[PDB]
């Protein structure tokens, strides 16, 4: 029985060992996913001792990322532009790979929602670790560009400037915007954002990457300024996952299935 | 489809529950799902409340939070208020949550079916701490000749020997004290072995650590230095309050031979 697990939680619900135990019955892979416990020396040594006791992979939450990324003995290509790791996967010769699947899992969602990003115009709301995340997957789906906005203007454009050889790429303080886009993407925490609803035309589809019963403050925002669709992040959460299972097992579990267990719990558990 | 389990502990590093109760769960046609949660020493309570909140149908705890499970519970059964503990919680039809303790039947019925004759027996149990205290009744409730009770701190071997006095033969004494040989001696501490004279231990002695892993546990190695007739770890006592749970939790008690041979199989590898 293969060892994996997840680190931390920044909420107070776990929902990675579900969805990865579900992926692994799907396969019937003979392993174990579990929650582990970053303990009070940190994360560094507890990332040590499940690999030396015989793990194989584990994902990490904020606000550990960072310090996984400086665990890895290499990276991805996503992950290193990320700057962080949300995944981990000890190799046949003991080197421990990081990986970042959040941005490829947002991607999957959308497509899965059948949301067209080639040559679609995107707007991400936030430029923090979640944003920065997310930009080289979206990238790659060749939308014609993105436009990173942030309060405050500089963050933004630090952002922009850190991908700006990958496509076109654009910063513009919340305040500036004055047109329309065909895909928003909030990767902000809850707090609504200065910004002009007239960001949300009649085919514009927005993507909030939090996630609830009914509608995110954000989506009930946009829904009232006429938004063509609004979707929620549970789907996110569930693409990451199967991005960090394909990598560490090489198959590719029902994602969609998953998705809809976890909204049946998310409205009750009937 | 897909009732939520779980086991919440810490720090729970290498849980076989999981597997557990999945094969019970195919065996006996549940639809369900158990997953192992580790949870900081601080955040047990509100642990439990989110997991029941997304709708939960029942947990195992393990240490350190199973007197904390206690005060949890809306209510609890006879055998945990008993424990002093509980193991296993609960969510009833009503919205209530019940605390139950299975650890000391899990552990008599790894007994019975490994066929370690409890009625009429000696008993000696080492330890007098939340766990020795979660099978104490049990054991009584087999009829054995004697249980003897000994701690490294006297005192909390005598406060358990008098909680249930009422129960069977039950007599505490200090580790010093021990000077003849058990029929069945169980350790319920978690090498540095008790300082016990290893008088005993007779070749006809049954030895049960509730400690596993691979090869010999270190009192194990000990019992067995000194001729035990047969030396037995916990993965089986694991499995028995698993079983118990699950009953408890689903109305039917599932089998467990394939499970324990896999486990061990596993712990061997
Ligand atoms: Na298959
Ligand atoms: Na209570």
């Given at each position: 029985?293969?060892?994996?697990?997840?680190?931390?939680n920044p909420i107070n619900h776990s929902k990675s060992p579900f969805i990865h135990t579900l992926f692994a019955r799907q396969t019937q892979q003979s392993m174990i996913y579990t929650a582990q416990c970053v303990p009070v020396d940190g994360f560094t040594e507890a990332a040590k001792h499940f690999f030396a006791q015989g793990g194989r992979g584990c994902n990490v939450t904020v606000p550990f990322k960072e310090e996984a990324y400086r665990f890895a003995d290499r990276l991805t290509e996503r992950?290193?532009?990320?700057?962080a790791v949300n995944t981990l996967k000890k190799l046949d010769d003991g080197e421990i790979l990081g990986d970042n699947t959040d941005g490829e899992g947002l991607v999957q969602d959308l497509?899965?929602?059948?949301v067209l990003l080639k040559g679609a115009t995107i707007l991400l709301?936030?430029?923090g670790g979640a944003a920065r995340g997310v930009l080289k997957p979206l990238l790659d789906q060749q939308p014609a560009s993105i436009t990173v906005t942030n309060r405050t203007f500089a963050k933004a454009e630090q952002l922009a400037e850190l991908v700006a050889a990958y496509?076109?790429?654009?910063?513009q303080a919340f305040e500036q915007l004055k047109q329309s886009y065909d895909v928003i993407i909030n990767s902000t925490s809850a707090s609504l954002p200065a910004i002009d609803p007239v960001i949300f035309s009649s085919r514009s589809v927005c993507y909030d990457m939090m996630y609830g019963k009914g509608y995110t403050v954000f989506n009930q925002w946009a829904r009232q300024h006429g938004c063509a669709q609004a979707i929620d992040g549970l789907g996110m959460l569930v693409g990451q996952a199967a991005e960090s299972?394909?990598?560490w097992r090489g198959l590719r579990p029902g994602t969609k299935q998953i998705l809809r267990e976890l909204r049946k719990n998310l409205e009750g558990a009937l």
């Open positions: 029985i293969d060892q994996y697990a997840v680190f931390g992950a290193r532009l990320a700057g497509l899965a929602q059948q709301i936030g430029a496509g076109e790429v654009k910063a299972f394909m990598l």
